[model samples]
Target: LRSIVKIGQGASGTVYTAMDVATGQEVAIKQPKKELIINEILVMRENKNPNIVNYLDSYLWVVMEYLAGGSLTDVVTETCMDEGQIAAVCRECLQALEFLHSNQVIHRNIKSDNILLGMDGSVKLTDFGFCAQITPEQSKRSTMVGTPYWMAPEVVTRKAYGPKVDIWSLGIMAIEMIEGEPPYLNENPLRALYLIATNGTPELQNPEKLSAIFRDFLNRCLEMDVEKRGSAKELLQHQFLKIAKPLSSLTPLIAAAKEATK
Candidate 1:
């Protein structure tokens, strides 16, 4: 604990990367607020998937997981990743989403930064500060949460939304892989929200550079009407995913990135 150092910061408090003194394992610890941890904890406890990070320890003021290589945000921004690489990230996320939805959980926030890379070739979904859970009888959430650029229209308009909302953000992340940012990277946040609310659909912007099936997959993800959007399970069979290599394929990119930083 004495080696704890502030590595990042969240909305309510600082995030620390520290060593588990006894085991010598590195961990990430974050503090949100008294009320936010309850639902996040429940979701993490319920989810035991390979694609999502797990809690080694938990508390309202602290939560821990093995610190990862970095984030998809870092790799996509600095390196030119192939479609296979992109599909690997997407396929893993879909698995994570499917598990959460099957457990009646909603990850209200899904974005590149929250998707972390493991030095051991794992693509683990991290962060749960904005998760929601519902009974089987209920499916949609009415709350407005998540980053505007990646949020589904139902979320922005405060309409009842389901797991499909994450599908929308997943589409946006696909665009990020191609174009290096979401559709509204430079727009004002309010303006971005306005555009998404009005346009209701985002263009994939030159998806032909990738495969035809990949383009189609993005379209399914960006479907304006939530009902038409593919669920995580449905998307799992996508042809685009057929191209995805195992997570181990990303180790070269991770090593290159590390070398660049050094």
Candidate 2:
């Protein structure tokens, strides 16, 4: 290692941008516990999508390609998103979920903080700390995991869950992208959990902010019933995703956010 720059701090561990002096490469390093690190390593190894972060050499630290653009949490400001922009994020993230689920990996945590941005306009799904790799035939997961606000009701209820849980979180994230907060975000955190568990699917308080297509797309993702929830393959064909902007289109929004924060 030549140089190390701390980039992220999370419950799992600290994330850094480290340099390999031998090969002159800049890589991202995540220093989680030994067990947690292995989970990420195995998950990333099997889950490979253009929108998903790829695993790399981990001889010293859990290493991967470095993404300079930070994450969605950092880039999403008060006025950061538009219909097209959100559609782009949804499309890419759906792709990631599709690939992950196909490989029998459930990303228990699907939130803005885990969605990474790259300076080259790549959107990568990162931070697999709470990821679960299930058996090919065992579809339902029993553990309750994930951020409360973004969690599916089934997951919150501590019931058997499936990849559709990520779909629900993705829907919540779509709202977060548009309104700058999840539904019930203003409520007490525990109260928010209660509401998510008891209530049906939540919608925008003021529906005027989104068009018909976008609104429908969000609905498909947030379906409270796992049985009714659309799979990534099904949702990818949604009209909203059809015209969604590409990663290159997101370059300007990310640039604007970077300048605003500074």
Candidate 3:
């Protein structure tokens, strides 16, 4: 493998753009310090969804598909996605999460940085370093892990949480994709945590900027009570994603996006 470029750095590892010697294709190599390697591998093994990054290969460093467009957070920040584009990304993310939940996986981290964007606006959920497996009866978890800004209320409180916590984080991420920032950013970090835990998520406004159905759908995902939040399958039926066709239709767009980036 030859290094094509340096991607970025995160708490646990550094990302690099690399070329696969065998296939002559670009890929991302995540070189985590030895201590964190197992965590990364375990998370990837637990996630088995197309919308999630495919774990191509791993050794001392983790190698996976290289998404040329970079993180979804960066893409959304640079270009304002239309309602339809946003809906498409959200739908794919839901599909990935649904697959994970069905397999008892809980993605503890669901933020913009963890979501990668393909050149054609296709979105994939990545960075499963903090994920866990839980049963429906054991939905609550006590691990206080994950990025504070993107964490769920139950997580911040150190209460038992389950897959629904992922829905909360995804809800926050959905709004961030649409609004460009998390709600209540002005508050101190501690206050923000309390707000999310106590008051729940704020109501989304500016319906004129977004389709009414999409806004309502996002609201349902942002529901404060984990028990009240809708499942990923339910979200697939939500009006926002009802218009999104199958993954087959998105493949061509993903290929086009990658070619554009090249």
lDDT of 2 by residue, 229-254 (tens): 89998999999987777788878777
lDDT of model 1 at position 240: 91
Local accuracy of candidate 1 as per-residue lDDT tens digits, 1-262: 2222177646567777888688888888775253566666666766778888887665534656774577788777767789898899899999999998888888877888788888877898977879888787876789998989999899999998888899999999888878889988899989999999998888766756877888789888999867788999999999999999888988887877666655
Q: Model 3 clash tally?
A: 8
Evaluated at residue 219, the lDDT of candidate 1 is 82
Worst 10 residues of 2 by lDDT: 1-10
Clashing pairs in 1: none
Q: How far is candidate 3 from the true structure (C-alpha RMSD, Å)?
A: 5.1
lDDT of 3: 0.74
**Alpha carbon lDDT at 21, candidate 3:** 84
Task: Go through the candidates in order and give each one's C-alpha lDDT.
Answer: 0.82, 0.81, 0.74
Question: Using Cα atoms with residue i matched to residue i, what is each candidate's TM-score against the true structure?
Answer: 0.90, 0.90, 0.82
User: Which segments of model 1 are wrong by more than 4 Å?
Assistant: 1-6, 9-12, 20-24, 259-262
At residue 149, give the lDDT of candidate 3.
76
- Which candidate, 2 or 3, would have the higher lDDT against the true structure? 2
